[PDB]
């Protein structure tokens, strides 16, 4: 584990993330340069979940008791896509293929453990 240094992801729920991430990034700074390109959509608040979602992917949680990766649930992603994609579509921006939601576990499985709302 190391501590979150990227601005957009500070105080989202946890202060500790690991590297490399699901996107295969060396430093948080390298990861930050890319997630910062979403800064508009965060301010627009097209989805409340987007900041949490983008941060669970670019700086996934790191726990000292649970050493298996912990991704966001499919439902969390499907809501951020629901809010953001139309607006992004309007400006010629496709919903990123890494952000795809079927690549994520659905909630309600002991085998597929994830992060979501009830």
């Amino acid at each position: 584990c190391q501590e979150i240094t990227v601005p957009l992801c500070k105080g989202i729920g946890y202060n500790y993330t690991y590297m490399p991430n699901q996107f295969n990034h060396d430093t948080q700074d390298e990861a930050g340069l890319e997630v910062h390109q979403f800064w508009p959509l965060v301010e627009i608040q097209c989805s409340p979940d987007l900041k949490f979602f983008l941060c669970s992917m670019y700086t996934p949680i790191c726990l000292e008791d649970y050493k298996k990766p912990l991704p966001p649930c499919r439902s969390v992603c499907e809501r951020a896509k629901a809010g953001c994609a139309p607006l992004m579509r309007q400006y010629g921006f496709a919903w990123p293929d890494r952000m795809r939601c079927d690549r994520l576990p659905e909630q309600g499985n002991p085998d597929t453990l994830c992060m979501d709302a009830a």
Partner: protein, 294 residues
Amino acid sequence: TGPKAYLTYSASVAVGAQNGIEECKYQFAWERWNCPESTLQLATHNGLRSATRETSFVHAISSAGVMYTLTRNCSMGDFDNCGCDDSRNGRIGGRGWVWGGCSDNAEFGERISKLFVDGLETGQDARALMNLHNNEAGRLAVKETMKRTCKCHGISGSCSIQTCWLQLAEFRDIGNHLKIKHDQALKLEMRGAIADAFSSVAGSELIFLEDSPDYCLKNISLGLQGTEGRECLQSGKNLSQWERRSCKRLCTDCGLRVEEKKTEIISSCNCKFHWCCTVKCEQCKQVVIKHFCA
């Protein structure tokens, strides 16, 4: 090749050869010969003076282990002397991608691996050429398996533009590969008349001379401990038809009987995830029943 160099790499090399032995142990986990080999043994040559098919695999996978580990040693910040493959960096390798990153220095790993592993192959005899061959067979297995890995640094992460470098495959995949190379190795019948016959053999393929002993049987002269007292697999949800046969293969076909052994183990389980930040996993006592030859 001076004792100052031999010492600076020796720690890492020993770790490497062990990885090779451990993977060999993995690949043959449920076979009659189960890699009863030590790291030490490939220096002592005790437990493998038998130019059998299986001795070929040991040479390759351990040579492959030394090279793999030190190539990765080099690439990470472990040796000051070697950087990585800076050659070809910066260039344009294809449509919408460029070279860069830290491509693994395989030629460095091969360099060291030859120094230690091929060193132990003392003698100018036919067996020593055989073993020398098998070393490179595993060594070049490590090289060929290298693949272009990439990171997409386009707009918003799009793979439109990307930086690539040349990376090692997972050592497992090298083990699986060399396992195959072992399964289809071939026997040789044979001073320069011998050295001719070895050059008629592809550098990738494994060479062996003697036929392999009955591995059901104990033969302390060969370092073979017999199949008795070995765990086998009976029941399993997702076991290879191979794995399901392990009990008949290791035990009954060898004359021995199949006994069960009740083991209780403690495993973290039944995990529930609290909202945000935390996950709390209670631990459970679980009963696993193992099987073995008696």
